[PDB]
Amino acid sequence: GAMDKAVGMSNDGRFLKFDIEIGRGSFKTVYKGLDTETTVEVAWCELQDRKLTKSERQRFKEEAEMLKGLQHPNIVRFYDSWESTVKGKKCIVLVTELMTSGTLKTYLKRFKVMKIKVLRSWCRQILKGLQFLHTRTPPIIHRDLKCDNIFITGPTGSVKIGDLGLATLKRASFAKSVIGTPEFMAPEMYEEKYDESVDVYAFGMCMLEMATSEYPYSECQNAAQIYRRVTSGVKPASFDKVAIPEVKEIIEGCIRQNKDERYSIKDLLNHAFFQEE
Ligand SMILES: Nc1ncnc2c1ncn2[C@@H]1O[C@H](COP(=O)(O)OP(=O)(O)NP(=O)(O)O)[C@@H](O)[C@H]1O
Numbered sequence: 001g002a003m004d005k006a007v008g009m010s011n012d013g014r015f016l017k018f019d020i021e022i023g024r025g026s027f028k029t030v031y032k033g034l035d036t037e038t039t040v041e042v043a044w045c046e047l048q049d050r051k052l053t054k055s056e057r058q059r060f061k062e063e064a065e066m067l068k069g070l071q072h073p074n075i076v077r078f079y080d081s082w083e084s085t086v087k088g089k090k091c092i093v094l095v096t097e098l099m100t101s102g103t104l105k106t107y108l109k110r111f112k113v114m115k116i117k118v119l120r121s122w123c124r125q126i127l128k129g130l131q132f133l134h135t136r137t138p139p140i141i142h143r144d145l146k147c148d149n150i151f152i153t154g155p156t157g158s159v160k161i162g163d164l165g166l167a168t169l170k171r172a173s174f175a176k177s178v179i180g181t182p183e184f185m186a187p188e189m190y191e192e193k194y195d196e197s198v199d200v201y202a203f204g205m206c207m208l209e210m211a212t213s214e215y216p217y218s219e220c221q222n223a224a225q226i227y228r229r230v231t232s233g234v235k236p237a238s239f240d241k242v243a244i245p246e247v248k249e250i251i252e253g254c255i256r257q258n259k260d261e262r263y264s265i266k267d268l269l270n271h272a273f274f275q276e277e
Helices: 054-068 104-111 116-134 167-175 187-191 197-212 223-230 237-241 245-254 265-270
Strands: 006-009 015-024 028-035 041-047 078-086 089-097 150-152 159-161
Touching: 015 041, 028 089, 054 078, 054 089, 054 167, 104 150, 104 197, 116 159, 116 197, 116 265, 197 237, 197 245, 197 265, 237 245, 245 265
Parallel strands: none
Antiparallel strands: 006 015, 015 028, 028 041, 041 089, 078 089, 150 159
């Protein structure tokens, strides 16, 4: 069967690809693969864009080297990446930990609401992962945090942050200058700046999504209206639907327009909402 047809391999024979398509987006196709060295299944991802400039691919090679030496139990593990030659163009392959239980976003669609104990636990694990990344030397900023790339190991398991280090390549992809997902992007990111606090802003919106089970700014007609609102400090309408005042208050501190007024991650971890139990 399916697991007997290895239709691709890394140069070393470590990773094998099976013709089992497990998902597809506009950036990436994901296939089930095998790590022959540990026997664990992995996610073998193939980038849709086969016309990235030499310079884009070179920069990503340097990025993948750093990603390959980072590990934390709340971060989806990055194993390797290389360029395969498929047809007429350089197809980039990434191999990552296989996540078998979907995302926070699909969890919210399935269960409709998140219980406040589950919220607290998962938000705390996201915060530990970000805090790990922010305290490396040098610091690593994710830049593209959202509910869609936060994975779970099971409905009562643990959270892993996905897509670390792919924001530059996602921007290059199809030469479209996509900077991120408007709903989660701090105001300063449209001026081409980022610091650690963009991740605090995005964490705040993830928390807003988990507390309300709706996408932030779903009232907005398009990304332009979101841009205008965020860069004048107009909150998403869902902020007033937040039912737990402590939660509301954390979200408020995370999404402040002025980056310097936002909570630090350490502030967040010591908050009574998280520090309790
Ligand atoms: N490590 C993983 N293990 C298993 N499935 C994954 C993994 N990473 C992504 N997927 C799934 O593969 C599908 C496509 O991934 P996704 O990240 O939506 O694609 P994308 O092209 O990067 N982004 P977008 O264009 O915004 O959809 C989604 O259903 C993901 O849940």
